[PDB]
């Protein structure tokens, strides 16, 4: 994608994460499991919902539109009516398909941007207390329990708390 996260340095998606679009997978001595990031997932839901509603709202309700009749001496007016109907139909078909195509590319990139931002948010939180082992994973230089994992999942990781430990393992 455009931001290099989805189908990029994070190769695949997680079937085990059913709660949200983005989230975390942890592995410590207490166990392992998936956990979605509610803040970023909820934000992406609202924007896309407004985005869907925007497309539907821009299209007005099609009120009654019927054919008309012309006698054998009104072929010019009949053809003008056909030219009007076809012309408007040509434009609206062009607008509908193009808007969906253009907006679909934007949605995929919007998700791609969100994954990278979430990955970068954790990276700046951990600093050198963990190491980037690729594929969007961090290997901690210190013991990190469920309480510590939760502090990474939200934005309250205490870097000075584990810095002294992490330096020793990093050596």
């Amino acid at each position: 994608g455009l931001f290099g996260a989805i189908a990029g340095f994070i190769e695949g998606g997680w079937t085990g994460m059913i709660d949200g679009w983005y989230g975390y997978h942890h592995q410590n001595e207490q166990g392992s499991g998936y956990a979605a990031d509610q803040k970023s997932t909820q934000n992406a839901i609202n924007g896309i919902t407004n985005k869907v509603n925007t497309v539907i709202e821009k299209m007005n309700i099609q009120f009654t539109a019927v054919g008309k009749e012309f006698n054998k001496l009104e072929k010019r007016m009949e053809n003008l009516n056909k030219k009007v109907d076809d012309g408007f139909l040509d434009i609206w078909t062009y607008n509908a398909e193009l808007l969906v195509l253009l907006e679909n590319e934007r949605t995929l990139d919007f998700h791609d941007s969100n994954v990278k931002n979430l990955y970068e948010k954790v990276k700046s939180q951990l600093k050198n207390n963990a190491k980037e082992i690729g594929n969007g994973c961090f290997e901690f230089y210190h013991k990190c329990d469920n309480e510590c994992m939760e502090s990474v999942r939200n934005g309250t990781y205490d870097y000075p708390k584990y810095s002294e430990e992490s330096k020793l393992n990093r050596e």
Partner: protein, 325 residues
């Protein structure tokens, strides 16, 4: 032990939905929304609780003139749209020209109701004139008949007196008046029916003023008739008077229609059948129950409908690229 790990990832599932983008087509995604409606119930339904007017075997011309082969409707009807069957076997049955017929159709497109009433009663309005004229062109049950709303005036006891009849519109709504002008194929028939050669018909209102004269000539037979009947109409405003004056050839009005105006109506041709259903959107193929913005069912729509497009598919992605591997 390698140590404790945390990982960032994205959702995937078993969805097989595909969308197109500008850079790449056929992208499998986790979630999507269809925006194109393609389903209809295949029936003719009531629109906002109001049933349409089904003319059955008649077209507009056949119903307005009162073709005898069509089942007569109730004297008062109210509708939301008008349906003509694709095979309207009954229209104009005596050959001729329906002047401004298409304009009258567009007038009826904004009409919500009619009342059929006797503008000129048969046995009250035409003394000294024969009113029993029929023709094999407009047959009914194998016998010659005539339009239910018109009266063929002919000579009575060797004479056709100059008639002068008028009607004042006291219905409080516009009144549609239709009449015909007969053109015999030879002057011998002109005398036999109307006893005058220099015949004429005069129809006047406050805003209508026209005079008709017979044109006599041999013509190719149409529906076994070498004569012609030209049909005319006008809308009589509330409180206005229409005056008929003729000394021959007038196909006099007998019934007229008091009309009410409406919104959102129209005339459509449909093969479908009436059903006990209600819809906010009706097409000649069927009724649509959708909040989607687009539809590829039919361009002819009645009511509140999605916009018709030629597209075969319009799917907007909402989720992510689906990579369950």
């Amino acid at each position: 032990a390698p140590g404790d790990t945390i990982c960032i990832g994205y959702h995937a599932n078993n969805s097989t939905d595909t969308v197109d983008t500008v850079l790449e087509k056929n992208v499998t995604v986790t979630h999507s929304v269809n925006l194109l409606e393609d389903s209809h119930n295949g029936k003719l339904c009531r629109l906002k609780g109001i049933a349409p007017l089904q003319l059955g075997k008649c077209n507009i011309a056949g119903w307005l003139l009162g073709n005898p082969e069509c089942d007569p409707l109730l004297p008062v009807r109210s509708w939301s749209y008008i349906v003509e069957t694709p095979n309207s076997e009954n229209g104009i049955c005596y050959p001729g020209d329906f002047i401004d017929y298409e304009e009258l159709r567009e007038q009826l497109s904004s009409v919500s109701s009619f009342e059929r009433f006797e503008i000129f009663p048969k046995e009250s309005s035409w003394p000294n004139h024969n009113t029993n004229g029929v023709t094999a062109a407009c047959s009914h049950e194998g016998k010659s008949s005539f339009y239910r709303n018109l009266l063929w005036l002919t000579e009575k006891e060797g004479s056709y007196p100059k008639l002068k009849n008028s009607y004042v519109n006291k219905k409080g709504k516009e009144v549609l008046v239709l009449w015909g002008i007969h053109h015999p194929p030879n002057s011998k028939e002109q005398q036999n029916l109307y006893q005058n050669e220099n015949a004429y018909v005069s129809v006047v209102t406050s805003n209508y003023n026209r005079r008709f004269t017979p044109e006599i000539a041999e013509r190719p037979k149409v529906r076994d008739q070498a004569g012609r009947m030209n049909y005319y109409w006008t809308l009589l405003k509330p409180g206005d008077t229409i005056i008929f004056e003729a000394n021959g050839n007038l196909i006099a009005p007998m019934y007229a229609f008091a009309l009410s105006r409406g919104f959102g109506s129209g005339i459509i041709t449909s093969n479908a059948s009436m059903h006990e259903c209600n819809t906010k959107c009706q097409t000649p193929l069927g009724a649509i129950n959708s909040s989607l913005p687009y539809q590829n069912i039919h361009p002819v729509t009645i009511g509140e409908c999605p916009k018709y497009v030629r597209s075969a598919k319009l799917r907007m992605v909402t989720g992510l690229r689906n990579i369950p591997s």
